[PDB]
Amino acid sequence: TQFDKQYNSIIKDIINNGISDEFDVRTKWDSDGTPAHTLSVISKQMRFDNSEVPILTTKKVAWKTAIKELLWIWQLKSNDVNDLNMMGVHIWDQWKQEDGTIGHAYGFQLGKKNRSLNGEKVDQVDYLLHQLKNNPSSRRHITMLWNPDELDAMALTPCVYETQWYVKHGKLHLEVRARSNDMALGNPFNVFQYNVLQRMIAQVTGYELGEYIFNIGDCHVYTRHIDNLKIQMEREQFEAPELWINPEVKDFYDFTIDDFKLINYKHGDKLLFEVAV
Template sequence: MTQFDKQYNSIIKDIMNDGISDEECNVRTKWDSDGTPAYTLSIISKQMRFDNSEVPILTTKKVAWKTAIKELLWIWQLKSNDVTELNKMGVHIWDQWKQEDGTIGQAYGFQLGKKNRNLNGDKVDQVDYLLHQLKSNPSSRRHITMLWNPDELDSMALTPCVYETQWYVKQGKLHLEVRARSNDMALGNPFNVFQYNVLQRMIAQVTGYELGEY
C-alpha cells in the first residue's frame, strides 16, 4: 500500500465511524436519477502529508489519472473556463455545470487567467506572477494562488472545492500546501491529491527547484 492508501483508508474509517449526517438539513445536492436529496456523512479538518518519495495515487481503487491531468492542464495551463476546450481533450466531467455560453462561469481557470497582479508595470495573472515570484523572491511567504473570489462567487456555475495553494521554498526544495473547502472522498479526493502533486512537480521543474513535501 502507498502512503496515500494508508492515509485515505484511515480517513474513510473515521467518516464511517464518526461521520455526522446532514439528513436533517435542506441540502443543495440531489441525485441525478430521481432528484432526491443526496445526503452525506462528513468530518472536519483532516490533513494529508506526503514526503514525495512516491506519487500519491491510490492502488486500492481505480483513479482516472489521465482525466485528472487533463483537467489540471485545462485549469492551470489553459486557464480556461470553457467546457468545450475540455471536451476537445475527451473529458466531460464538467458538462453537468456547463452554462448556455459553454463555460462554468467565472470559476477555476477564469480566476487564474485574470490579469490582476502588478509586475514591473504590467498586469499579469496569478500563475505567471507565482512563477516569477518563486524564482525571484523564493523566501517570501506570499506565494499563494486563490480561486475563492467573493466578488464573483455568484457568477460561478460551481464554487471551487479546492480553492487555494500556498508554496514554500526551503533549502532549494519546493513545498506545496493545498486547501479545500469540501472534498468528496469517493471521487474528488483521489483526483485532487494526485493532480495537485502533478502540478507541484511541473512547477518545480519550471522553477528549477527540487521536489519538497506536499
C-alpha cells in the same frame, strides 16, 4: 507515504465518528431518485513527502483526466468547457452556461491580469512562477480561486480553491486546501491532481521536490458508498507507480498531455460508486 494508508484512516474515521446531515442536504441519487445522505468530519489533512506518487491502488484513479482538467484550469486558464471537450473530457458539461463557459470560475481567475509585475499586469500563475525563482523566501506564494467580488458570477464555486508554495532549502513544498471534498469520488482524483502540478512547477523552476500537503475542510462520504468503501479498505495495496514527465520541458506552457505517463499502475479492481445529482 501511501495514499491508501491515509485514505483508509480518514474513511474509517468518518464512518465511526462522522456527523450525519436531513433537512440539510437535498441530493437525489441519480439511479432510483431516493435521497443521498452523508456522514462528515471536519478539518482533515494528508501529508506526503513526495518519495512516491500519492495515488490509490485499492481502486483505480482516472489519472489522465485529472491531468487534462488540471491543464485546462492552470495552463490554458480557461472557463470554457468547449476547450476541455476538445481535450476529450465531458465531465463539466452539466455546468456549461449559455456561452459554453462556467462563468468567472476556475481558469478564469488564474488568467486575470491583476498583478503589477515590472510595469505590466500579469496573472496569478505568471506572477507565482516569477516570484518562485526571483523571490523564493516569500511567505506570500498564494493562488486564490475564491474571489469574493465575483462569487455570484461563477457557474460553480471551487472545492480546491487555493494553494500556498514554500521554498525551504532548495525544496519546493505545496499546500492546497479543499473547502469540501467527497472522499469516495472527488478526493483521490484531486490529491493526485495537485501533486502533478507541484512536480510540473518544481521542474520548470528548478527546485527539488518538497512536501505535499492536502487539507480538507468538510470531509464527507455518502452513506450508500459505505459498504463498498468498507470492501475497499480490505483490498490489497501495491507499491505506488512511477509518474514519467517529459524532462525536456522547461517552460510551463509547453507541457502537453503526451508529456505524462504513469508507469506500472497496479490497482484493486472495479468498485464504482453511484453519483448523486
